[PDB]
């Protein structure tokens, strides 16, 4: 129990700020060492060593205390692109050097739209038995997605797209299947969507 | 140019051997191995303060390490198991008054048994839409087992990140995966017939003789993609 | 877009402490409402009327500044049973009195437990076709739980029990059919439980 | 002694009619109808600051409200739909420079066409176990529609609270549902054979000439449980 992180789990709309706090063993100690891990090899953010400290890089602070297990970690303006695992590590004796990783904070943070126009639309293959795929989406980043209903059907969970050209920042999921008798409305009948929905016919 | 370790991904049965090779040219003094997986975390496997001397981690056994130089600190998997499945990270401490610790992409690999488990995935890509408001077109690879994959879309002949969102997690489909990935663009960008577009999945499979599949073929490393084309409608 | 929340979600560990903002509109404007709901009517916490205000009532305080759209809601030591969602309302003219509710601010807490030993067990009916039930308990509150393999199966999540007598919070979750062909090992692995874990044969 | 309404629980087919009553007589000036679900939040249908004259909220339509006196502020659905399937709170405002609205326990009502797909639930027991290292046994409701339930634990004769856990949401079978519950005791405590177990549900169903259930029985409103004794192994 040489480290443990505090809030586990975090989920905010985009902008704001938060505030991480992360608690250590004061016999014996070194620099915490803030890493970002976003499916794929940590990145190395903050090295707290021997400082006092009010301490900033970028739009972030690492500012610690003593106050003998604490540290800041502030934010500011949460962009989409921040969702990650943020770990405070470790270091310590004897033996070293080594360090000691948490369970990390899961952090996720929701795009804003504006103008939601969600919906649910159609489409078909390039050269195909006529195979189809529904797709849901233009919808609030906050509406859950259900699983396989029958677990012999593949649904996706929310994932949000952009373009840097047009500003768009659009959520979206998928649904399909092979059969013929598959029908988007039928489909994710699972959750009930907002009746700002879409369904041609 | 910092610390960069190879392969990335891998494959094998159980009871075989692996070499996982880690070069920085930095000049570090320590380098570090890290284990992870969903549930267990991240966790230390072997440590080197220096060329010529190793030491153990919290999990040493099923590994070996030898480092003859300072550049180069490989491990070693005598054994292959189905606890061995995992993401290894070679990492970088350098380090003079430094704690600063640095680490290589990322190397995936996972254990097997029978190994005629591995499948090439099957591209998809569908063309829509009726109700083009703003064009949002999907990619799919379907029933490809390992899990390592790596997607993307050629839009004229060139990658672009643009428009672009896959599933970080690919869906099961009881082995097997499958996994989804999505464009959008402009209205009359999709409406221009003389626009190409090609959803292309990298799956990393089997070298040689092992041999091949159930009911022969073979699941090589290869590339397989879908192609479609701007429509006037 | 009277009043915006955040966080959106939080996730704690017991104890330690939350902040919750919530942002209004400046006109017009009156009292802030807190509330907090859990799987059930709302029950009132605070009202923050015409106050400065330095604010608390029990573990809770509601301090709140201008700062034109703000409010603290501290918290001390957090409990198992203080997992609900939190409402801060809204009240503002024209046409008094009425209340604007925001999306919430969903909070669940951990429990803590000190030595898990973690297993899965098989039980049966009292008088029946000898049909029977699989249990995952005593492991940690933080590990996941897999839905429906195949949806013809039933499991249920994380749930946790107490004794005030004994002290013991004890998580578990239950997964059961009909078949023969049914067992605990071959149920669940569809998410990886600890090696701590149990399987009697 | 503060906000009382009624009835907790409802079902009926659609294009039908039913009015929910809500008392205080704590003497309140201003009276509440909020309707609540999972994806719309809790929003305000009708409001009333005084004995006779009402207003509309968000949601007027589909509803209406009559008030004669200032103890009482009933709603009524003159056409049941799918729609207005929900859980509803009468409010309290009293107030003088008081913004305080206390809320009654909350009503929860279903819509549903063919009135046939209403369930009694199946209780039963499950007495474990082997590897008792220190018990804890669960009750399974099965197969029951629609979702209005009150479960609970009672152990020689008296309902505990004590080492009982319940899922907060019960489980879909496909309309329709499954609920689990759990109690722990200590092992010395279910090895006597003096101690009796029931796991009991309340169902809350039709009351009168639906006419029940297709093949025939009837969905009244009724209890159903299971039983258990100590065993002395
Ligand atoms: C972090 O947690 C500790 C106790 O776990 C607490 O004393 C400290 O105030 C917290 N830090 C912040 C910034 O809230
Ligand atoms: C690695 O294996 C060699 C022989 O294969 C052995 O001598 C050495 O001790 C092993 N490494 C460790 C750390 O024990
Ligand atoms: C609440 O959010 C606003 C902006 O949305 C910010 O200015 C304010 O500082 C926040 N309050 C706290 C206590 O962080
Ligand atoms: C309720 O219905 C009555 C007649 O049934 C009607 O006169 C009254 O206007 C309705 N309520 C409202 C708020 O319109
Ligand atoms: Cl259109
Ligand atoms: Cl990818
Ligand atoms: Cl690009
Ligand atoms: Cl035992
Ligand atoms: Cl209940
Ligand atoms: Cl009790």
């Known amino acids: 129990p040489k480290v443990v992180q505090s809030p586990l789990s975090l989920v905010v709309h985009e902008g704001d700020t938060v505030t991480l706090n992360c608690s250590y063993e004061?016999?014996?100690?070194?620099?915490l060492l803030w890493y970002k891990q976003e499916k794929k090899a940590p990145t190395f953010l903050f090295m707290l060593?021997?400082?006092?400290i009010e301490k900033k890089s970028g739009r972030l602070s690492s500012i610690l205390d003593k106050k003998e297990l604490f540290s800041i970690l502030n934010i500011t303006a949460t962009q989409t692109g921040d969702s990650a695992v943020y770990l405070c590590?470790?270091?310590?004796?004897?033996?070293?050097?080594?360090?000691?990783f948490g369970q990390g904070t899961i952090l996720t943070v929701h795009p804003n739209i504006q103008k939601p126009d969600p919906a649910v639309y159609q489409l078909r293959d390039s050269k195909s038995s006529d195979k189809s795929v529904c797709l849901f989406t233009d919808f609030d980043s906050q509406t859950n997605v259900s699983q396989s209903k029958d677990s012999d059907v593949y649904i996706t969970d929310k994932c949000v797209l952009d373009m840097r050209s047009m500003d768009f920042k659009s959520n979206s999921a998928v649904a399909w299947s092979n059969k013929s008798d598959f029908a988007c409305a039928n489909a994710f009948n699972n959750s009930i969507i907002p009746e700002d929905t879409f369904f041609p016919s | 140019a910092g610390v960069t370790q190879t392969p990335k991904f891998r494959i094998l049965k159980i009871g075989q051997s692996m070499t996982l090779q880690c070069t920085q040219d930095?000049?570090?003094?320590?380098m570090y191995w890290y284990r992870q997986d969903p549930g267990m975390g991240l966790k230390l496997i072997y440590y080197?303060?220096?060329?010529?001397?190793?030491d153990k981690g919290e999990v040493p056994n099923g590994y070996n390490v030898s480092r003859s130089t300072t550049e180069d600190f490989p491990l070693r998997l005598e054994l292959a198991a189905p606890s061995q499945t995992s993401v290894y990270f070679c990492?970088?401490?350098?380090?003079?008054?430094?704690?600063?610790?640095?680490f290589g992409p990322g190397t995936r690999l996972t254990v097997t048994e029978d190994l005629k488990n591995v499948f090439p995935p099957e591209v998809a890509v569908f063309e829509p839409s009726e109700a083009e408001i703003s064009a949002t077109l999907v990619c799919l690879a379907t029933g490809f087992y390992p899990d390592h994959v790596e997607l993307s879309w050629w839009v004229n002949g060139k990658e672009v990140h643009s428009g672009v969102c896959t599933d970080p997690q690919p869906l099961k489909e009881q082995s097997r995966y499958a996994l989804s990935s999505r464009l959008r663009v402009s209205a009359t960008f999709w409406q221009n017939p003389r626009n190409h577009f090609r959803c292309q999945v990298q799956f990393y499979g089997l070298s040689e003789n092992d041999e091949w599949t159930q009911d022969r073929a073979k699941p090589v490393t290869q590339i397989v993609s879908a192609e479609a084309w701007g429509r006037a409608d | 877009p009277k009043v915006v929340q955040s966080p959106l979600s939080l996730v704690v560990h017991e104890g330690d402490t939350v902040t919750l903002n919530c942002?209004?509109?400046?006109?017009?404007?009156?009292?802030?409402?807190?509330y907090k709901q859990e799987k059930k009517a709302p029950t009132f916490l605070?009202?923050?009327?015409?106050?400065?205000?330095?604010?608390k009532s029990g573990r809770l305080s509601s301090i709140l500044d201008k700062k034109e759209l703000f409010s603290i809601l501290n918290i001390t030591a957090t409990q198992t049973g203080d997992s609900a969602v939190?409402?801060?309302?809204?009240?503002?003219?024209?046409?008094?009195?009425?209340?604007?509710?925001?999306?919430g601010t969903i909070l669940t807490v951990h429990p803590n437990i000190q030595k898990p030993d973690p297993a899965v067990y098989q039980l049966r009916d009292s008088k029946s076709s000898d049909k029977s039930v699989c249990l995952f308990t005593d492991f940690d509150s933080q590990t996941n739980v897999s839905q429906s393999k195949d949806s013809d199966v039933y499991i249920t999540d994380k749930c946790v029990l107490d004794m005030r007598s004994m002290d013991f919070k004890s998580n578990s979750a239950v997964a059961w059919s009909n078949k023969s062909d049914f067992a605990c090992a071959n149920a669940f692995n569809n998410s990886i439980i600890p090696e701590d874990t149990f399987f009697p044969s | 002694a503060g906000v009382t309404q009624t009835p907790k629980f409802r079902i009926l087919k659609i294009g039908q009619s039913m009015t929910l009553q809500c008392?205080?007589?704590?003497?309140?000036?201003?009276?509440?109808?909020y309707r609540q679900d999972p994806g719309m939040g809790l929003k305000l249908?009708?409001?009333?600051?005084?004995?006779?004259?009402?207003?509309?909220?968000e949601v007027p339509n589909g509803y209406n409200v009559s008030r004669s006196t200032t103890e009482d502020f009933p709603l009524r659905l003159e056409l049941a739909a799918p729609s207005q399937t929900s859980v509803?709170?009468?409010?309290?405002?009293?107030?003088?420079?008081?913004?305080?609205?206390?809320?009654?326990?909350g009503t929860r009502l279903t819509v549903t066409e063919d009135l046939k797909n209403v369930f009694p639930p199946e209780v039963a027991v499950f007495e474990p176990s082997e590897a008792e290292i220190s018990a804890t046994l669960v009750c399974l409701a099965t197969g029951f529609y629609p979702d209005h339930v009150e479960l609970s634990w009672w152990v020689n004769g008296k309902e505990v609270h004590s080492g009982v856990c319940t899922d907060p949401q019960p489980l879909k079978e496909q309309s329709r549902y499954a609920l689990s519950s759990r109690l722990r005791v200590s092992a010395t405590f279910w090895q006597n054979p003096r101690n009796h177990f029931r796991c009991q549900v309340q169902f809350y169903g039709l009351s009168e000439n639906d006419e029940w259930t297709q093949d025939r029985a009837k969905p009244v409103t009724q209890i159903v449980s299971a039983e258990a004794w100590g065993r002395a192994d």
């Open positions: 004061v016999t014996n100690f070194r620099s």
């Open positions: 990492a970088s401490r350098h380090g003079l008054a430094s704690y600063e610790q640095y």
């Open positions: 590590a470790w270091a310590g004796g004897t033996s070293y050097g080594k360090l000691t």
């Open positions: 080197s303060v220096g060329a010529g001397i190793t």
């Open positions: 060593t021997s400082s006092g």
């Open positions: 930095m000049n570090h003094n320590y």
